[PDB]
Design a protein around this ligand. Structure first.
Ligand SMILES: CCOC(=O)Nc1cc(-c2ccc(C)c(NS(C)(=O)=O)c2)nn2c(C)nnc12
Ligand SMILES: CCOC(=O)Nc1cc(-c2ccc(C)c(NS(C)(=O)=O)c2)nn2c(C)nnc12
Lengths: 112, 113
């Protein structure tokens, strides 16, 4: 790996740790979630994010964060507020954005 | 746990792969190298650097690079130029400052958005 791949893999691992049951690990299928592919036109999941890291497709932590935000947003859009998926998405969106906050990235940038 | 620790571990693994015989793995003893402590007053080795990462004692990649350079510099100071230890220290020093150069660090710094 390159260093940037290492940093992204670290963040991804930290995020995945917040999803022990692997809800966000792979794309949501219509067989599990009726209408999903019509409601969510921009699907995303941690597997796809890993693959983009491996294929070296991310230029920046901002790009990585945007895919994470999309993933959580999709879950909060498709699922009703009282569901496990909505509540978990909400919790991890906020936690992940704190973990990768502008301030934390600035201190990391300083430490080089 | 933590981004800096992961990055330093990455650099450290890549450097240690260039020392297959493990000459730099642990502190050099006077038993191994006579008179070593009489000459080298600020010893360093990969083991100590690893412990420092794990204990999160490195606050910058600069602190890290300086320890690495000290390690190599010690080997070139104690051993003569036609020895395996001097030659390897020179080789790995060059390798490390290529890997952890300002150019390469700027590219990473930029990737932190
Ligand atoms: C109508 C039933 O809804 C669901 O079963 N939805 C989801 C199921 C598994 N994951 N998932 C994720 C991620 N986001 N939504 C879901
Ligand atoms: C006049 C003879 O001079 C020397 O023997 N010099 C040096 C010797 C070795 C060395 C040998 C054997 C072994 C097994 C190891 N590995 S270790 C320290 O973990 O036990 C290291 N490292 N070294 C380093 C660095 N810098 N100088 C030397």
């Amino acid at each position: 790996s390159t260093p940037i791949q290492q940093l992204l893999e670290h963040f991804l691992r930290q995020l995945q740790r917040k999803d022990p049951h692997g809800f966000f690990a792979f794309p949501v299928t219509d067989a599990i979630a009726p209408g999903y592919s019509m409601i969510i036109k921009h699907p995303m999941d941690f597997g796809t994010m890993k693959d983009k890291i491996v294929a070296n497709e991310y230029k920046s932590v901002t790009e990585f964060k945007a895919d994470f935000k999309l993933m959580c947003d999709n879950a909060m859009t498709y699922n009703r507020p009282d569901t496990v998926y909505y509540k978990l998405a909400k919790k991890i969106l906020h936690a992940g954005f704190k973990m990768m906050s502008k301030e934390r990235l600035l201190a990391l940038k300083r430490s080089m």
